[PDB]
Amino acid sequence: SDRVAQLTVGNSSITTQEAANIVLAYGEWPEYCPDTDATAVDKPTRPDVSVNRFYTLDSKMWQENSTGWYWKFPDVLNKTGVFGQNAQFHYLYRSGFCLHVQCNASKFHQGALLVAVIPEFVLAGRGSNTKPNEAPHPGFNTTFPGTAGASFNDPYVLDSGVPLSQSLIYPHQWINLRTNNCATIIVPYINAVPFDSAINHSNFGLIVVPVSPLKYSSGATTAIPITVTIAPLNSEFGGLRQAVSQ
Amino acid sequence: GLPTELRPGTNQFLTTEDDTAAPILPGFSPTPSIHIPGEVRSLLELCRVETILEVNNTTDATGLNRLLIPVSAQNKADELCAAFMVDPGRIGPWQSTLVGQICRYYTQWSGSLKVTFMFTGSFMATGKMLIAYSPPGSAQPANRETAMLGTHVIWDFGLQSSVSLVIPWISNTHFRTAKTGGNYDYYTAGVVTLWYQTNYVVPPETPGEAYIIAMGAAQDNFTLKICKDTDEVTQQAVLQ
Amino acid sequence: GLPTELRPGTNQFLTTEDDTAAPILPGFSPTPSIHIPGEVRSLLELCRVETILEVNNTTDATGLNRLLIPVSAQNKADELCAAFMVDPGRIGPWQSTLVGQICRYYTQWSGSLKVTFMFTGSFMATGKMLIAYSPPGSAQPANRETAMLGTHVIWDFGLQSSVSLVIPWISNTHFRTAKTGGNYDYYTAGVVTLWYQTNYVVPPETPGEAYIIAMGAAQDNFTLKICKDTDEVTQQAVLQ
Amino acid sequence: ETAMLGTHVIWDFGLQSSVSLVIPWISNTHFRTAKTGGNYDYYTAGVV
Amino acid sequence: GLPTELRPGTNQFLTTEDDTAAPILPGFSPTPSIHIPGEVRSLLELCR
Amino acid sequence: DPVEDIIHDALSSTVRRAITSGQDVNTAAGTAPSSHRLETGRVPALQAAETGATSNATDENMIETRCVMNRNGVLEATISHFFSRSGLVGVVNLTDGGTDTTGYAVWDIDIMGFVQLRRKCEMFTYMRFNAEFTFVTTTENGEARPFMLQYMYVPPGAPKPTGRDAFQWQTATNPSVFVKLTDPPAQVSVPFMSPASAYQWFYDGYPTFGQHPETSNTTYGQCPNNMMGTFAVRVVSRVASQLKLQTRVYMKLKHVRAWIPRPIRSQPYLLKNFPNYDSSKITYSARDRASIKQAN
Amino acid sequence: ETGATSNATDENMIETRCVMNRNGVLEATISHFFSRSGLVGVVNLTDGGTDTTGYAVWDIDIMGFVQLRRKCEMFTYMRFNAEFTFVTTTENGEARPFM
Amino acid sequence: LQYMYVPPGAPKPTGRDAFQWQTATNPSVFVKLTDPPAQVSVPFMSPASA
Amino acid sequence: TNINYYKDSYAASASRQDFTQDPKKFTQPVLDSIRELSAPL
Amino acid sequence: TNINYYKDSYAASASRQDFTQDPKKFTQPVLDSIRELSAPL
Ligand SMILES: CCCCCCCCCCCCC/C=C/[C@H](O)[C@H](N)CO
Ligand SMILES: CCCCCCCCCCCCC/C=C/[C@H](O)[C@H](N)CO
């Protein structure tokens, strides 16, 4: 009665049989920018069916010695669908997201994933150089991975200095292969400005860390993939001009 | 006496403090005021006034010709006529107008702007222009098929020789700083380009070289933030 | 003028004083605030949130394996699985959680705590555990017949893979300090031990090694006293 | 990644072993003919 | 500012003065008091 | 009316109720007595951390408790009283000697230079507040000597001073503080001066468009809505006064509002603007023990 | 050519939304524009043995330093009350108890 | 001079110019040697009731 | 509620701050009021 | 009854201290309210 669940957005739907809950980040739904908070004078555009739907990224294979992955939003949806085109043609972007991560496994596999969102997930350069002119900084592809998504190098510190233990203060959810098989999170627009660019600043990042490593006996299925799907909700765009990829 | 305690901040002289000061002349009665027309109460009355824009600020363009963008009969269509960035705090054309010289006394500006284009050509000479303001992103467009996508207005010549394109307030933050360059270009406002919509058609025995006067001003929702020392004046020694 | 008298305490700068200060910008109107979700008003909202506990903080346990206590099929019954002291101000497991890193900014803490144990084993693997919090006194128990006397809960595996043992507020004084060691152990809070209630029974072709995630948090009657400089950060020179 | 753009549903296994995807009526004309091939492919309905 | 005048007695520290002093910990709430028997309010209870 | 799929949602997209109402909590929560309950189906101990919600198993539902009219205070835990204590922010070194023929010092306003306050104000992602600055100024030995000093605030855009007696020090518009070295520290109040709606200490993005390199990505994360100008200091004189001077700045955060909490940093700091660390020396948050089942 | 500035506002040119603009305009009034003190004049009193004058004299004229002159010359007729503040140091910037 | 209050638990200074003197949280009193004595008020800070 | 400690009015601090704009005397100083949406000439 | 001697609001000392908690947005940020004494799943 509470394990089964169906989400539906636009022309897409998602079923699930073992996930039990919907984590609403910070207890607020995605809403449109009210007039008392808007700064842009122009009229934005609100498709609400061309962009508000479930885009399914590629799958990442969970290995016995994996280290975790991260995505940036709305970086992933900048080349796919009408969302990608609107974000490439418009300067001001605003939207909440609905994340849904699936990693199914038999009742004999064991493991646990931590699926969290990090508002303003600033990455860090791993290096002991203390002068700001020779210090290492993460490359562009390492900080804005894109639809492919990037992997961690040392997830215990989330590649951002902060420990992973306290990362549970963020809107998070576990994928425990004994109880649930997918985790979902509805996150609103989290930013210090009414609108913002969609190709320069990524509002937040998604984190999938295999805390309890995958373990199974011989003969079971070795290829355990993880699939993420994202639905931008209550999206607005403004400031139309020629297409700028980045 | 009354017990008091002196806190940090004593004996300091804050140049912007709002406090009283002992008068020198007790029982003083100044010269009565009369009615002098043209009283200004806030600098936002000054930002709304149109002032000419040094948009032809190129070398080998000395004198008053900086205030004139040329217009001529083009043999090639879709051709660019002029362009300039719409950042009043930036150096360039806006550095000459009033809004652009008074927006430098404050740090952050907000609100829309407007740019009036007055045609100073002959009466028999007609034409059409396309004035396109492109919000931030890439650099200025290459062709006008790319510029037509931004905010724009198609200006027809004839009577009422001046059109006015309003640069709306399209931004993320409520305010933009006057400083640009470096990582302050995050506060850039885009570029406005003037393209030849069709041409500059002219009958015989009429000059094929005309000029356009660009004037800039602030809209009615213009506002400013923290004061600041301007950077347009320099002094070495006292003026003796 | 008005007769006054200066008392001791003048011209001093108390870093924690609550007083006014002359503004630099008169007639200032800041950028209006918007609605940013997730506003926090007091740090007690942060102490209630569960955060993982570095309870496997042993040498030769590098990496993320510090957050995992192992569980395996024991051939000997009544066997101990894990243990740790319940003093958040103390160094150890609590040093990683949020309540334990924010209880170091204050000196004295009060209120109950809770510890959630999530099982990350297979679905077919069952078992029972005994989580026993022993108030102060002797050191940790030797056998579980001694631990069963303290506060405890018997956790069964299956669906709802996480139990939560609440460490009540059992103390003499209304507050305990964050510092321990020396004669400050008078403020110790006891030890919590996790024993194998029965076993970790597992069917064939299922791994016999599972893990348990320990998370810690503060209860609803948690409160804190005088602020304090944390001792978890060190700096030699300015960060240039 | 190209198919996810159309109408779709993500089916999870477990109890209730059958899902049902509804192919909506997305067309220009009110009716489609049964014949296909040649210039009758103008009445094609897509692929699942 | 308000015109004042400093009188003799400034900057002195009278050990028996009855005056205020800037607190170090703002928004402080001490440990609540309990009932401890045998409260003495004046030394004349001790002389008897 | 003619087409109603457009009206059915326009009049349905109002403010959606997201009830999470808080209440005014003056003191810590008490407790209510509880007897033993031998009942099936009602289990407050069994939780599920996979729901992303923290356990709600309170004391009364687990063990038999008494009642206590808890009178403890919670006021010292509010972020207002948490950031209400001033701390060191930046220190400038003005060497107005004969060999240093500069005469003035300049400090880019950046509170991320000293870990003590950075570690606190970085546990929250978006902060909006008013600051209370206090300038103590001594010599290199810690002595005070009656030399008048001028602190000028140079907002972003204004011309920075170029000499001890340059014209920029006229401060016709820039706010400025003239104070003697033998006076109480100079204290002023500064408002929320960001162009945005809140300061953000972490800005996962770039300031400008364009191609971003992969070797030296020195521009990542640097948000301009944080940089609030510059602080210049000089000694009011025409010729050099041979002394080494040191000005320390302390800031108090009042009328604070914080948003989107953040894990408190564990690894040491290495850079001011960037949250760098070193993968070679990962300092684990928990000290090491001998064994796991040997709580010390 | 009418001498009047354009009145084409935003709503009449492009399709705009509505915004309850809460920005402030108080820091643009001339009151708060000139409410900040600035340098006006500096006198040099060399009371040495070679300069047997002992006093200095300054003709009150604020048009000597550009910083404030450039501001107060953007208006042609001004009427105001001034608040003067005299800082006095030595040539090195030292204070010494001389009345 | 700088007087710092180090409650039980905080790191005690280790040098004249060590980082502990940043007093980001610890209360501190900066006062000159030629000023009136520094006076503050401290509450009942014991964890017990007396 | 600001106050002045001296009996001379020119010793007060910021007696009255006002919000009074009148741009129509610099932006539209014309005789016959031009409408906002009509042709000027 | 605290007071501010300047007409600028950002010069006051501690204008208003508040007791307003809302942990249910960090501790229980879920869609369907879980009961305190029932089984979660
Ligand atoms: C004459 C007075 C000079 C002192 C006043 C200088 C103005 C102070 C402005 C402070 C701006 C807010 C506090 C600064 C925050 C962080 O440093 C920045 N966001 C970047 O680190
Ligand atoms: C004992 C007090 C001495 C200081 C007071 C001197 C009187 C100041 C009179 C100021 C007169 C109005 C301000 C001066 C304006 C311009 O300098 C003049 N219009 C010419 O430049």
Side-chain angles (χ1 to χ4, degrees):
Chain A
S1 197
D2 197 355
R3 311 301 292 280
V4 299
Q6 169 177 322
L7 316 181
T8 178
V9 177
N11 67 326
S12 79
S13 279
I14 291 183
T15 312
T16 184
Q17 291 280 94
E18 294 209 352
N21 213 351
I22 310 296
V23 174
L24 181 47
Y26 301 125
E28 304 212 7
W29 285 86
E31 52 181 301
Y32 289 138
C33 181
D35 290 27
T36 184
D37 299 332
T39 181
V41 75
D42 65 66
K43 175 178 292 182
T45 66
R46 311 173 171 96
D48 289 337
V49 185
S50 315
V51 301
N52 298 4
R53 52 181 311 282
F54 274 112
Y55 303 102
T56 306
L57 314 192
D58 59 299
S59 307
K60 288 273 185 299
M61 217 64 61
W62 187 356
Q63 308 272 354
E64 54 161 296
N65 57 352
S66 179
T67 176
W69 309 268
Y70 64 84
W71 289 269
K72 296 296 188 70
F73 293 93
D75 184 293
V76 288
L77 313 166
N78 282 134
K79 271 92 176 183
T80 46
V82 186
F83 190 98
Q85 311 308 125
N86 278 85
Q88 288 177 0
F89 277 85
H90 293 69
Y91 173 52
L92 307 176
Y93 151 80
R94 165 194 192 82
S95 178
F97 284 95
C98 179
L99 280 293
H100 193 100
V101 176
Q102 309 80 314
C103 173
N104 55 4
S106 200
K107 308 187 174 181
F108 286 66
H109 296 77
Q110 72 192 27
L113 294 174
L114 169 66
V115 179
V117 311
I118 321 294
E120 305 285 359
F121 183 35
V122 174
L123 294 178
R126 304 148 70 261
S128 54
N129 298 87
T130 312
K131 308 201 212 174
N133 49 29
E134 62 200 324
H137 291 103
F140 170 60
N141 270 314
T142 302
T143 185
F144 279 174
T147 306
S151 85
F152 272 109
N153 300 314
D154 50 355
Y156 175 71
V157 286
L158 286 176
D159 288 22
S160 174
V162 300
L164 186 137
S165 300
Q166 309 157 27
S167 86
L168 267 59
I169 73 186
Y170 287 131
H172 75 297
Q173 207 161 352
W174 296 86
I175 296 181
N176 203 342
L177 293 181
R178 66 168 294 114
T179 67
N180 69 339
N181 70 328
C182 74
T184 174
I185 307 181
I186 301 179
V187 63
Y189 185 64
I190 303 178
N191 199 339
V193 286
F195 300 73
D196 209 327
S197 190
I199 50 179
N200 281 347
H201 170 219
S202 84
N203 290 132
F204 62 85
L206 182 84
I207 289 302
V208 173
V209 183
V211 180
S212 279
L214 186 74
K215 191 73 167 51
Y216 53 85
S217 60
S218 168
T221 313
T222 55
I224 308 305
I226 294 164
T227 290
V228 60
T229 71
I230 300 100
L233 305 175
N234 286 249
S235 55
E236 306 186 11
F237 303 84
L240 170 55
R241 81 287 190 197
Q242 90 276 1
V244 60
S245 45
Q246 67 178 352
Chain B
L2 186 74
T4 76
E5 268 175 333
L6 261 50
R7 294 294 165 200
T10 65
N11 302 322
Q12 80 179 356
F13 174 42
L14 184 48
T15 56
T16 66
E17 182 66 22
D18 189 318
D19 206 278
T20 81
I24 52 176
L25 298 149
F28 180 79
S29 313
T31 308
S33 54
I34 63 180
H35 183 55
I36 310 171
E39 184 179 9
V40 61
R41 317 193 201 272
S42 77
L43 299 187
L44 304 192
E45 313 195 356
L46 269 51
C47 294
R48 295 194 182 90
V49 189
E50 302 269 38
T51 59
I52 311 172
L53 214 61
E54 293 214 72
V55 61
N56 185 16
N57 50 354
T58 65
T59 72
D60 286 320
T62 73
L64 215 56
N65 293 355
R66 303 172 80 85
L67 320 165
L68 306 151
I69 48 176
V71 168
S72 58
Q74 299 276 330
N75 49 11
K76 205 194 313 306
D78 301 3
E79 211 57 33
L80 176 53
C81 172
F84 57 97
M85 276 201 166
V86 69
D87 291 325
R90 210 188 195 90
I91 67 183
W94 289 97
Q95 197 173 346
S96 178
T97 59
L98 194 72
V99 60
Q101 274 288 340
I102 194 162
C103 178
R104 291 175 178 274
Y105 269 109
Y106 302 90
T107 303
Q108 293 155 318
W109 63 280
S110 160
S112 296
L113 317 169
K114 41 192 166 61
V115 175
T116 189
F117 288 102
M118 191 178 67
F119 187 50
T120 67
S122 178
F123 173 66
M124 314 298 290
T126 57
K128 297 210 182 216
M129 311 295 283
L130 165 60
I131 314 160
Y133 157 72
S134 311
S138 181
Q140 60 164 30
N143 49 356
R144 85 156 145 77
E145 295 83 3
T146 297
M148 77 185 180
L149 298 167
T151 302
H152 70 90
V153 55
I154 298 176
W155 169 26
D156 197 331
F157 296 156
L159 295 92
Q160 299 155 46
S161 50
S162 82
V163 69
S164 68
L165 178 146
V166 62
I167 295 90
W169 177 241
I170 294 182
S171 178
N172 46 11
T173 64
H174 299 252
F175 284 93
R176 289 182 171 129
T177 65
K179 187 162 193 167
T180 48
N183 54 6
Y184 277 108
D185 275 9
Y186 168 83
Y187 296 121
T188 307
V191 59
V192 63
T193 62
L194 167 82
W195 305 78
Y196 274 97
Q197 177 41 274
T198 73
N199 210 4
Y200 168 74
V201 185
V202 71
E205 293 279 274
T206 301
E209 297 290 330
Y211 291 117
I212 293 186
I213 297 279
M215 289 162 284
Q219 259 290 337
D220 203 48
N221 58 330
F222 198 78
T223 185
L224 297 149
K225 275 188 80 54
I226 64 178
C227 284
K228 178 173 74 76
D229 284 297
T230 181
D231 48 295
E232 308 268 334
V233 59
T234 289
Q235 170 186 357
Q236 293 295 32
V238 190
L239 298 175
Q240 54 83 23
Chain C
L2 186 74
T4 76
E5 268 175 333
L6 261 50
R7 294 294 165 200
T10 65
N11 302 322
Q12 80 179 356
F13 174 42
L14 184 48
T15 56
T16 66
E17 182 66 22
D18 189 318
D19 206 278
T20 81
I24 52 176
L25 298 150
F28 180 79
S29 313
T31 308
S33 54
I34 63 180
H35 183 55
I36 310 171
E39 184 179 9
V40 61
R41 317 193 201 272
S42 77
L43 299 187
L44 304 192
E45 313 195 356
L46 269 51
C47 294
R48 295 194 182 90
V49 189
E50 302 269 38
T51 59
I52 311 172
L53 214 61
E54 293 214 72
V55 61
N56 185 16
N57 50 354
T58 65
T59 72
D60 286 320
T62 73
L64 215 56
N65 293 355
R66 303 172 80 85
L67 320 165
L68 306 151
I69 48 176
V71 168
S72 58
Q74 299 276 330
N75 49 11
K76 205 194 313 306
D78 301 3
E79 211 57 33
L80 176 53
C81 172
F84 57 97
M85 276 201 166
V86 69
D87 291 325
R90 210 188 195 90
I91 67 183
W94 289 97
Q95 197 173 346
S96 178
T97 59
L98 194 72
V99 60
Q101 274 288 340
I102 194 162
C103 178
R104 291 175 178 274
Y105 269 109
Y106 302 90
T107 303
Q108 293 155 318
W109 63 281
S110 160
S112 296
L113 317 169
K114 41 192 166 61
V115 175
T116 189
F117 288 102
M118 191 178 67
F119 187 50
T120 67
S122 178
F123 173 66
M124 314 298 290
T126 57
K128 297 210 182 216
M129 311 295 283
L130 165 60
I131 314 160
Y133 157 72
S134 311
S138 181
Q140 60 164 30
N143 49 356
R144 85 156 145 77
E145 295 83 3
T146 297
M148 77 185 180
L149 298 167
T151 302
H152 70 90
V153 55
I154 298 176
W155 169 26
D156 197 331
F157 296 156
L159 295 92
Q160 299 155 46
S161 50
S162 82
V163 69
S164 68
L165 178 146
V166 62
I167 295 90
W169 177 241
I170 294 182
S171 178
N172 46 11
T173 64
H174 299 252
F175 284 93
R176 289 182 171 129
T177 65
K179 187 162 193 167
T180 48
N183 54 6
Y184 277 108
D185 275 9
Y186 168 83
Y187 296 121
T188 307
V191 59
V192 63
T193 62
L194 167 82
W195 305 78
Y196 274 97
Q197 177 41 274
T198 73
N199 210 4
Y200 168 74
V201 185
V202 71
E205 293 279 274
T206 301
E209 297 290 330
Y211 291 117
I212 293 186
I213 297 279
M215 289 162 284
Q219 259 290 337
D220 203 48
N221 58 330
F222 198 78
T223 185
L224 297 149
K225 275 188 80 54
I226 64 178
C227 284
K228 178 173 74 76
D229 284 297
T230 181
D231 48 295
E232 308 268 334
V233 59
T234 289
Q235 170 186 357
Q236 293 295 32
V238 190
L239 298 175
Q240 54 83 23
Chain D
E1 295 83 3
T2 297
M4 77 185 180
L5 298 167
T7 302
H8 70 90
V9 55
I10 298 176
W11 169 26
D12 197 331
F13 296 156
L15 295 92
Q16 299 155 46
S17 50
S18 82
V19 69
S20 68
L21 178 146
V22 62
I23 295 90
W25 177 241
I26 294 182
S27 178
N28 46 11
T29 64
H30 299 252
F31 284 93
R32 289 182 171 129
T33 65
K35 187 162 193 167
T36 48
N39 54 6
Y40 277 108
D41 275 9
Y42 168 83
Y43 296 121
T44 307
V47 59
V48 63
Chain E
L2 186 74
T4 76
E5 268 175 333
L6 261 50
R7 294 294 165 200
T10 65
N11 302 322
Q12 80 179 356
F13 174 42
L14 184 48
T15 56
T16 66
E17 182 66 22
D18 189 318
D19 206 278
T20 81
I24 52 176
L25 298 150
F28 180 79
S29 313
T31 308
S33 54
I34 63 180
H35 183 55
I36 310 171
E39 184 179 9
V40 61
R41 317 193 201 272
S42 77
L43 299 187
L44 304 192
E45 313 195 356
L46 269 51
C47 294
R48 295 194 182 90
Chain F
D1 204 20
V3 58
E4 62 83 22
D5 61 87
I6 183 175
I7 310 170
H8 164 269
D9 63 63
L11 277 73
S12 183
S13 189
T14 44
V15 193
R16 184 137 160 76
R17 290 189 76 82
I19 292 307
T20 317
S21 63
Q23 51 190 56
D24 286 30
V25 61
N26 193 3
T27 71
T31 64
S34 47
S35 181
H36 49 252
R37 35 172 294 160
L38 297 171
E39 297 272 83
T40 44
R42 276 163 288 282
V43 286
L46 276 300
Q47 298 298 315
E50 312 98 301
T51 77
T54 67
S55 73
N56 49 5
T58 175
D59 309 340
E60 311 95 303
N61 305 344
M62 305 280 294
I63 63 168
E64 309 194 40
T65 80
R66 63 179 291 156
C67 82
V68 291
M69 314 304 196
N70 207 336
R71 296 175 290 156
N72 285 340
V74 310
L75 181 52
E76 213 172 8
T78 56
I79 64 181
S80 307
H81 292 256
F82 184 53
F83 295 98
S84 164
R85 48 200 61 250
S86 299
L88 178 64
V89 175
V91 58
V92 302
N93 289 300
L94 179 62
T95 53
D96 204 348
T99 42
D100 175 316
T101 176
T102 306
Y104 66 100
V106 182
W107 177 60
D108 212 338
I109 293 194
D110 216 334
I111 77 176
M112 304 277 117
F114 285 80
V115 308
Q116 274 271 13
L117 191 144
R118 178 172 172 181
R119 187 172 195 278
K120 289 171 58 177
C121 78
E122 270 199 355
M123 83 168 53
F124 305 111
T125 291
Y126 297 104
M127 289 188 68
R128 166 184 179 95
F129 54 83
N130 300 300
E132 186 171 283
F133 272 64
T134 304
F135 297 97
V136 302
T137 308
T138 73
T139 58
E140 188 67 331
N141 44 45
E143 186 175 5
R145 216 188 314 271
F147 280 99
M148 181 164 283
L149 294 169
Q150 163 165 20
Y151 315 126
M152 207 170 62
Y153 174 42
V154 183
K160 306 165 186 180
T162 185
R164 174 170 44 248
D165 210 347
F167 83 99
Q168 289 90 343
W169 295 105
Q170 295 177 37
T171 83
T173 60
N174 280 338
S176 172
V177 180
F178 289 85
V179 67
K180 276 182 295 305
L181 195 64
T182 77
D183 265 10
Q187 184 176 57
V188 296
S189 185
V190 291
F192 174 78
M193 300 194 315
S194 184
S197 302
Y199 298 111
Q200 42 188 318
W201 312 118
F202 306 81
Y203 175 68
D204 183 16
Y206 297 75
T208 59
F209 299 85
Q211 184 62 256
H212 298 304
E214 299 213 2
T215 71
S216 86
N217 203 24
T218 186
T219 181
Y220 170 55
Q222 290 180 357
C223 174
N225 293 335
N226 297 116
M227 41 196 74
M228 280 287 104
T230 304
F231 175 86
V233 63
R234 76 153 178 171
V235 58
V236 178
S237 182
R238 188 173 59 187
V239 303
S241 49
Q242 305 288 310
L243 59 85
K244 316 292 184 172
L245 212 69
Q246 193 164 354
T247 301
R248 302 164 145 78
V249 192
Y250 298 82
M251 85 177 289
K252 207 183 93 182
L253 289 91
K254 38 176 181 172
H255 316 138
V256 188
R257 310 189 67 188
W259 282 290
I260 296 101
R262 181 162 304 268
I264 307 169
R265 188 175 177 101
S266 84
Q267 309 299 322
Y269 293 92
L270 294 177
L271 295 177
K272 184 154 58 186
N273 307 303
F274 313 95
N276 262 16
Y277 68 92
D278 47 341
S279 45
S280 315
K281 291 196 306 303
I282 293 298
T283 299
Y284 300 112
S285 178
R287 297 298 113 183
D288 296 348
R289 280 146 54 201
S291 171
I292 171 166
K293 53 195 70 175
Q294 197 40 60
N296 54 8
Chain G
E1 312 98 301
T2 77
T5 67
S6 73
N7 49 5
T9 175
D10 309 340
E11 311 95 303
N12 305 344
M13 305 280 294
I14 63 168
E15 309 194 40
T16 80
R17 63 179 291 156
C18 82
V19 291
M20 314 304 196
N21 207 336
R22 296 175 290 156
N23 285 340
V25 310
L26 181 52
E27 213 172 8
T29 56
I30 64 181
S31 307
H32 292 256
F33 184 53
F34 295 98
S35 164
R36 48 200 61 250
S37 299
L39 178 64
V40 175
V42 58
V43 302
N44 289 300
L45 179 61
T46 53
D47 204 348
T50 42
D51 175 316
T52 176
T53 306
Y55 66 100
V57 182
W58 177 60
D59 212 338
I60 293 194
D61 216 334
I62 77 176
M63 304 277 117
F65 285 80
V66 308
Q67 274 271 13
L68 191 144
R69 178 172 172 181
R70 187 172 195 278
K71 289 171 58 177
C72 78
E73 270 199 355
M74 83 168 53
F75 305 111
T76 291
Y77 297 104
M78 289 188 68
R79 166 184 179 95
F80 54 83
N81 300 300
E83 186 171 283
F84 272 64
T85 304
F86 297 97
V87 302
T88 308
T89 73
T90 58
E91 188 67 331
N92 44 45
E94 186 175 5
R96 216 188 314 271
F98 280 99
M99 181 164 283
Chain H
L1 294 169
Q2 163 165 20
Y3 315 126
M4 207 170 62
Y5 174 42
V6 182
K12 306 165 186 180
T14 185
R16 174 170 44 248
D17 210 347
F19 83 99
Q20 289 90 343
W21 295 105
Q22 295 177 37
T23 83
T25 60
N26 280 338
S28 172
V29 180
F30 289 85
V31 67
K32 276 182 295 305
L33 195 64
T34 77
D35 265 10
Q39 184 176 57
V40 296
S41 185
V42 291
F44 174 78
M45 300 194 315
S46 184
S49 302
Chain I
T1 179
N2 67 286
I3 198 68
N4 177 350
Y5 320 109
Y6 319 92
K7 297 183 288 297
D8 291 78
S9 46
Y10 67 96
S13 47
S15 158
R16 277 182 179 174
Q17 50 82 10
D18 61 57
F19 308 95
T20 313
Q21 270 193 50
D22 199 5
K24 259 200 167 54
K25 91 177 66 175
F26 303 111
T27 68
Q28 272 213 320
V30 290
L31 202 68
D32 54 353
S33 88
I34 300 289
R35 299 90 171 180
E36 42 186 349
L37 82 172
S38 86
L41 314 186
Chain J
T1 179
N2 67 286
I3 198 68
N4 177 350
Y5 320 109
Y6 319 92
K7 297 183 288 297
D8 291 77
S9 46
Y10 67 96
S13 47
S15 158
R16 277 182 179 174
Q17 50 82 10
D18 61 57
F19 308 95
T20 313
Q21 270 193 50
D22 199 5
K24 259 200 167 54
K25 91 177 66 175
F26 303 111
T27 68
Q28 272 213 320
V30 290
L31 202 68
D32 54 353
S33 88
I34 300 289
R35 299 90 171 180
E36 42 186 349
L37 82 172
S38 86
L41 314 186

